[PDB]
Amino acid sequence: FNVHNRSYLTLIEYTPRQIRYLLDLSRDLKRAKYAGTETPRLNGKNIALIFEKTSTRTRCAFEVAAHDQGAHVTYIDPNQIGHKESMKDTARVLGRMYDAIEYRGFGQEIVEELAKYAGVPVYNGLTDEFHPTQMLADVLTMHEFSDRPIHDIAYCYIGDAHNNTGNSLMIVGAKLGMDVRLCAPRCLWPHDELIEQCRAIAATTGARLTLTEKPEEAVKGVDFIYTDVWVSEPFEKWGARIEELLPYRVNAALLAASGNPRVKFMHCLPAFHDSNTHVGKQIADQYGLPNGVEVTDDVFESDASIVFEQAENRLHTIKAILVATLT
Amino acid sequence: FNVHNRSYLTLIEYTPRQIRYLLDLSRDLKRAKYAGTETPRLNGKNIALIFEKTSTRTRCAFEVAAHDQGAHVTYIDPNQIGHKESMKDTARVLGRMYDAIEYRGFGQEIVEELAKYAGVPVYNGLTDEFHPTQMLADVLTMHEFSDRPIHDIAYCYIGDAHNNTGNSLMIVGAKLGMDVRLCAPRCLWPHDELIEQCRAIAATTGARLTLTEKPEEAVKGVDFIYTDVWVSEPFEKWGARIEELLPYRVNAALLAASGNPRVKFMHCLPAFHDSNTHVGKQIADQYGLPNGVEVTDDVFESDASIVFEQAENRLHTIKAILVATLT
Amino acid sequence: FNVHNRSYLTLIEYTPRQIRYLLDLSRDLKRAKYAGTETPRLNGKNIALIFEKTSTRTRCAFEVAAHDQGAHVTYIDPNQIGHKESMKDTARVLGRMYDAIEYRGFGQEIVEELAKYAGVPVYNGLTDEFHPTQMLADVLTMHEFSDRPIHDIAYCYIGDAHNNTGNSLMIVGAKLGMDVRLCAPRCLWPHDELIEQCRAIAATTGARLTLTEKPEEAVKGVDFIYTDVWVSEPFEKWGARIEELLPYRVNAALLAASGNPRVKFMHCLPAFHDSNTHVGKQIADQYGLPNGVEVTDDVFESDASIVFEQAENRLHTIKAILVATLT
Amino acid sequence: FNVHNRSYLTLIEYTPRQIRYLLDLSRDLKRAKYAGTETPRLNGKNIALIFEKTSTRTRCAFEVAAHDQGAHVTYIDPNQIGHKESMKDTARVLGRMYDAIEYRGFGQEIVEELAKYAGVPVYNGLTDEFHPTQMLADVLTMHEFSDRPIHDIAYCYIGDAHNNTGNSLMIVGAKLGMDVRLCAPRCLWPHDELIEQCRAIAATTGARLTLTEKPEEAVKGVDFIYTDVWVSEPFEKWGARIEELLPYRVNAALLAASGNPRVKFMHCLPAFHDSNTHVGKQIADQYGLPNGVEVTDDVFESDASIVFEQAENRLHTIKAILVATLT
Amino acid sequence: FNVHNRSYLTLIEYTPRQIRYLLDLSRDLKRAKYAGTETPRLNGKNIALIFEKTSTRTRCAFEVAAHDQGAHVTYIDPNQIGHKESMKDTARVLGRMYDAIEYRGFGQEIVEELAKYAGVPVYNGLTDEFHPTQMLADVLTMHEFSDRPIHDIAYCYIGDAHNNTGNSLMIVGAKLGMDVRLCAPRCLWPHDELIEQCRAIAATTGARLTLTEKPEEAVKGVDFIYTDVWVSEPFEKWGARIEELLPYRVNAALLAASGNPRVKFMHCLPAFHDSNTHVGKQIADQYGLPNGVEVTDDVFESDASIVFEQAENRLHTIKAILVATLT
Amino acid sequence: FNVHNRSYLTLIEYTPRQIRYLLDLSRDLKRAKYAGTETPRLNGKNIALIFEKTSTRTRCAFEVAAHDQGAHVTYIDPNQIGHKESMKDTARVLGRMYDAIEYRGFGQEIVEELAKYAGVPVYNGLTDEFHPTQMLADVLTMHEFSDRPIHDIAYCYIGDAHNNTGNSLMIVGAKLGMDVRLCAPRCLWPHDELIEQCRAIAATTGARLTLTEKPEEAVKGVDFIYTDVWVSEPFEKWGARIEELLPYRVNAALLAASGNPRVKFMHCLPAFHDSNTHVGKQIADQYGLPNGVEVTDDVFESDASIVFEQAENRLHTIKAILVATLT
Ligand SMILES: [Cl-]
Ligand SMILES: [Cl-]
Ligand SMILES: [Cl-]
Ligand SMILES: [Cl-]
Ligand SMILES: [Cl-]
Ligand SMILES: [Cl-]
Predict the structure, then answer these.
(1) What 8-state DSSP symbol labels residue D305?
(2) Where does L-ornithine bind (chains A, B, C, D, E, F) (predicted)?
């Protein structure tokens, strides 16, 4: 019962042993779903889903995972917590009605208060600082597409690194002993406090945390290249960060710069890889990036891309979290 | 397995044999629900419901039908696909999480791309061009209220005919060999390309497709008179189309003009038949139509009206679609 | 089958015998949920939930209660009935698809029309005049925290008394013979018509209905003190009613004025007891009430407060309503 | 839930839409029993059966129908309600123990009081005025043996027409729009009050109610000829009514007088068609009618007779009533 | 297993501890039936029901209780044990076929012989001396309508006290320590032998057994007033006992004589409270008691009357007896 | 399927092979009931029980056997077939409602007509000529109390031999090859036609049928002595037959006359063995037979008596008949 009745706010609060137990559980549940061996063990359990920010992958992953294990789910639309009722008051009411709460919002303060007073497991769909449910899916995808042990895998996240995606990517790789590389301008590196935490963790696990501004050096010898949108947010901010992050675009030459023909590409999504989105065409017109913003359409649709296999693993990893905490 | 694992985008892609198989299935499932013989055969199946346009009849029909067969359902509120994430990207993620997708939106292009990349059955709740789920419910209702074969039934749709409702009403009647009549100004006839497709279909099935501008001639000898709202859309457009469609109002004299005392009245809904709706009173005040816009309150509430029996059959027909494609 | 197949619009339409049957049923279902003896008896039943006003306690109570008894539920977001489709038309469509309807909106006229034409049980989550689902939870909470019979319990609601919360609190206490006290300015007393109805009811049950403007006299000898927000509504109205209701604030001295060390405090929620809500800080800044608007933070968080036990009983009482009307 | 939780006292209180829903339900349940698709949906439900008059068809139909749907049944033998305990008192005790009551007795007053105070659905096995459970079976039998719509069917009841059998036969045919003919002496016509009710109903449904004294005119063009025993009752009354009803005997010439070789014969039973019953031989000896009283043995045993198919449909129609009111 | 495999002939053979265990069990089973938590634990068990005297409440209570716990039941109509076959012989045959026997007859000798030789539990529906199944229902009803402990409850039975109803009412109250009062002429007091048994029992339990001829003194301070019919029996005997029992009629003044506004009224039933019964009008005509014999119609139908809640508790108490002896 | 879908009217229509198959089946079902291995295989099957004559053993045996195999049963009280409705008409209605019919009446003609027209298996509880269900129980009892093969068993029936009990006892023993002896006055021997049938059967099976008037010779060497009541019937007939049957009384000396200390005694019941029955005392008073009519109380209650084990086997043998014909 190491993970029994535990909240899932960030992987910092988890040991490597526990993280790899959740990766193994996600593997077995994914296989059980395909093979038909899956048996529901959360029958009649209700899970509230706070979603102050919109979501497609995380919401659906929670709903289907829940239904596969016999649980029900209540989806709370953004259409306003903290406006008429405090987070502390809301936590103490949902905790007496629901067996678990998921929270997709703004501050780690908010979800930490939710966990403090809820009295039931609380999960972090995404905050401004961390995004741990995504990290479980990412490592599972890398393991599936890797012939080697998890601690021998190397990967480079490139782009806005001080956002929640880069923060948790640093944590997970340091936890599991793998070779992590964050590549970005020093303006967009994670806060030095968090970097220092992960340097200490890497000492105890053999992980190789490196932060650099030079892309061609960050991708050399990696198995996977990772990127995310450069803005979470007003349109005007795009102009500022496009100047900073222009050399960090993920194109065919970048994957070639790794020197690894087996290298794959990952993206937590949503992604701007073409001009077939409303805001995507707004960036392509004013700033002249028609065939992708942070990744080329070619790279995104190439055989090296595994972004959709990564997206599907959100279902199985979140399902593992539900089973490990409620059973 | 003629209909096994098939998308339902429009009835053009369906043979008459398949359409009547779905009508028969809707009849048996409707009877099984009342009699208690219904047995769930979609247990644990998840269905995503894209709803970019609001809906009461279609959403509820999907939810209850799904729950009656043991399936679950995720309702995606309008509150924005195509804004941050492309339809192609969304299709490839939901297709790995859900057993089927429903789409209620704008363009047949959108739902056709959804079907192309989803990898799972995709259903069309409504597009701007077609509305095939409604057509199945309409024909089932006519068959129930008809003592004669489906190919002997006659019906006239009157009003805005180039919208999705008139388009699919032309298709279904041509498929099933029945006597179809669209009555409207030539400004509001369906595009000649679609008319010509249905003329060709009617040749092979014995259907009698006729398009006319004269109401008293379109209703003579029909078993059912059909109408829909004249605007889908800004308020200002009402003034233009009210002038065009004023003589096409459905009143007691019109049903009398059919010459059939057994004639019934149908409406896909929502309908403006009185001044008890917010926009309905706005039309009644400025344009002076207090007792109904496209149909009189008397006609709508008369014993000849079967609009609510038609609405209920949405549950059973959609249920037939779910069973025939997922089983 | 006294309560079989009955709508739940207000407790005026219910006898004391029936109300206490629902309180007893809520007690047994609450105990059955904890003890594991609960057995689902609403399997496959669908319940539509109209929510024109936002809700946390009522929506979740319906969802979880429904799922505990094996029923499904469709949550209709505010994002507009009565705009394009009348309430009468909507009732006749949902009544053929759903086994029951809940309505959370504005006027008793709206939910009464829903019950008239739906053909299935209709429940009142909240209207402007009544809020009967809350009343069942309140009396259950008082009974649990009372060593004495229900008809011997005394309680005082203080604040805006002509709102839906004070109206139904008058009704329920008069029905059950208990000592009821509404304390407010005469401007904010319930309409004299409703007061006179409850005076007549109190004659037949032994209830002691008293309405007063003096707080220290209304709380003397009561077991529970009750309060609610002073505005449902624009911000500007707060200034007017804060002047009226300033002496009716619930502070430590008020509970002391009861003279009962066992006295408890209740609140239907949401509540403004601190400056940790968006609108709550707006009131605290302009009007200078930092530690609570209608109740002190101390009182709200004191051991005397039972507001969260009251909130949880919404699940069990609503569950009792579902079982008693659908079984 | 049009028929949910409703008593079944006479078809006057039922709309045509509801009656045809019960005919459809009887058809589906009859087919489900043969095909094996029937699934019990009344498990654990108890039904009391008041039988102040003896019964074979109605009692057994209730018992087997109940057992097929998983319900139990308590048969109260004639061996005396209203002797030591009032009907009102009995209703309020059985209503708290049983989910439904059936009543086979004397006056519509008795069963109407039972329904008033029972609090649960009450069914009328037979009263002196009406016999609605039989009517459902009769129309189902006619529909099965008719190639044409129900409203096009013609039938003639001949014999004692002011009894319960003729009364309800007038009601049902008027409800369903069919061509009804009662043939009897004016002494034995139904009360003019009831005739006038059914004339008004026939106006709104297209039914053709005709009452005549001439047999050869009443049977011309009918699909079914119906008859019943001429006395319910002392033996002495037979002499009086045999003189009146002698020309109304159902013999081979009468069916020939219809002019329809497809014509069938119906009888609610019990029937005196031979001298193989104790009272049947008493009539045959004194009054000299050896080969049948109201119908010839030849006609009763001819291929045109469908009285036993009619008797079997009592099971399926009563079963439909149980399902439609208790589910 | 204190009550396991035990016959239920009279409460004299039961300790107070066992009686209150059966009252508690009846409470839990009554609540389990309403709440849906009831689970059958007598599946496939057969219970023979000897009924030499007619019965409505006891027969139905046995049938429905049995069916609720999954047992079956065989109802033996009065239409003669002891005529061709002895009770001893019958007991030894039914004991090898049935899991339990109920007996409703004449002498305690008969049911005691049944228990002696049956080899299975035997229950006493009613004898001339005792009626213990009724007593369990009566005490349960008093407890439900009492805010105080069972041993503090006071009640007065008034009328024919030496019948089976008064005899067992004396026993049960003495067993449970409550304040019992039998009020009747000394001609109709129970036999002194039984009175002396209950005086001895009352010594060990604190019960206050008092027998008096003065009504106004017997009702002072009681919570419940109880009465029964004055004859079980020829019509001629009514004249004799009406003279004796005229001052013991239960009217509004009598309940007022208790001095307790909370006082309730009870009656095992059947009751003569109006002229709407065959024998009831015979008494009203000859003896001039039109508005009730032993209780006024006003009192019987007043809010103080709880006779029907008492009747319903026959189901739950008998059910408790079945469960406690067969499980 | 030798016995599949077959009526059971008399054992004459059954081969020895089939009879011993039913004896074996009764043995296995009796053992399965005690051991808990019994599994219901008649679920949902309805069995009508015509009982024109009263019955305790046969009715209960049918009810409990039916319920043990999951079947239901409808008990038709004597309170008149053949009075208003012919047997042929009744058979054709019950055959379409019930899976089987039992008949307990007067003439083999009646039950043979029932089987002819019913269309479903018909069983003979008892007629005036035969009583085959009893015979199966009798042989099973003899086999259980016999260490030797069935064809080596010897038994003597003594008393009124031309009744149904003696008739079928002759048939069964002749079928199974056992040594049968009927002992009675020649006035009360079975009809010579039936005797001659059984002599022919005994030739083919080795049975030893002997009819004698001398008791001491009929009992010599038998394993079982059998007797039944001397009148089925007015009281006056007893005087006539008591004179005839006085020397045929079953007393201790008679069992001694067999010369077999292991000899047992059997009686189909009801039996007059003492003065503890209403009619039994009438015979004892007028005719002076206080300690038994056809058997002494001593013999009936002696250890040699096995009448109650014989009675219990009615359940298991009838159960075998139900299983062998309906499965
Ligand atoms: Cl490129
Ligand atoms: Cl009009
Ligand atoms: Cl304070
Ligand atoms: Cl003829
Ligand atoms: Cl009075
Ligand atoms: Cl002897």
Answers:
(1) B
(2) 164, 228
What span, in angstroms and rounded, lies between the C-alpha atoms of B60 and C186? 46
- Token readout for F24 is 């074996």
Q: Among D77, D79, D83, whose Cβ lies nearest the Cβ of E277?
A: D83
Catalytic residue (one of B143, B228, B274, B310): B228
Interchain CB distance below 8 Å, F46 and D59 = no
Of B48, B84, B93, nearest to A277 by CB-CB distance is B84
Please report, as a single letter, which amino acid is at residue F145: F
Residues of C in contact with B313 (CB under 8 A): none
Determine phi and psi for E205, rounding to 5 degrees.
-120, -5
Burial class (CB in 10 A: 0-12, 13-18, 19+), F20: middle
Q: Is A88 on the interface with C (CB under 8 A)?
A: yes
Tokens representing A164 are 């929640």
In this structure, chain C runs to a length of 327
- Ligand 3 centre from F107 Cα, in Å? 95
Residues of A in contact with C64 (CB under 8 A): 46, 72, 74, 97-98
B34/D39 Cβ within 8 A: no
**Residue from A68, A69, A99, A131 carrying the catalytic annotation:** A131
Resolution (Å units)? 2.7
Instruction: Please state whether E49 falls in left (phi above 0), alpha (psi between -120 and 50) or beta.
Output: beta
CB D94 within 8 A of CB E60: yes
Q: Do residues D267 and D243 touch, judged by C-beta distance below 8 A?
A: no
The CB density around residue F197, as the number of other CB atoms within 10 Å, is: 16
Q: Which of A51, A234, C48 is nearest to B77 (CA)?
A: A51
Other C-beta atoms within 10 Å of D251: how many? 15
Per the structure block, which two tokens stand in for D140?
Answer: 């189902």
CB-facing half-sphere around the CA of E54: CA atoms within 13 A = 14
3-state secondary structure chain E: CCCCCCCECCHHHCCHHHHHHHHHHHHHHHHHHHHCCCCCCCCCCEEEEEECCCCCHHHHHHHHHHHHCCCEEEEECCCCCCCCCCHHHHHHHHCCCCCEEEEECCCHHHHHHHHHHHCCCEEEEECCCCCHHHHHHHHHHHHHCCCCCHHHCEEEEECCCCCHHHHHHHHHHHHHCCEEEEECCHHHCCCHHHHHHHHHHHHHHCCEEEEECCHHHHCCCCCEEEECCCCCCCCCHHHHHHHHHHHHCECHHHHHHHCCCCCEEEECCCCCCCCCCHHHHHHHHHHCCCCCCCECHHHHHCCCECHHHHHHHHHHHHHHHHHHHHC
* Tokens at C314, concatenated: 């919404």
Q: Which of A134, A156, A198, A274 is catalytic?
A: A134
Counting every residue written for chain F, the total comes to 327
Q: Which DSSP category does A238 fall into?
A: H
Annotated binding residue at F27?
Answer: no
Clarify whether A228 is annotated catalytic: yes
Q: Which residues of C touch E35 (CB under 8 A)?
A: 25, 28-29, 32, 38, 323
Method: X-ray
Residue D83 CA to chain centroid, in angstroms?
A: 28
Active site residue B83: no
Is any Cβ of chain D less than 8 angstroms from the Cβ of B152? no
Is B228 noted as a catalytic residue in this protein? yes
Distance CA C39, CA C37 (A): 6
CB of A204 less than 8 A from some CB of B: no
Ranges of beta strands (E only) in chain C are: 46-51, 72-76, 100-104, 122-126, 154-158, 179-183, 208-212, 224-227, 264-267
Closest C-alpha among B109, B105, B107, B120 to residue B53: B105
Give the number of whichever ligand sits closest to the CA of residue C292: 3
Q: Answer yes or no: is C131 a known binding residue.
A: yes
Strands B122-126 and C224-227: unpaired
Interhelix angle for D16-35 vs D164-176, to 10°?
Answer: 100
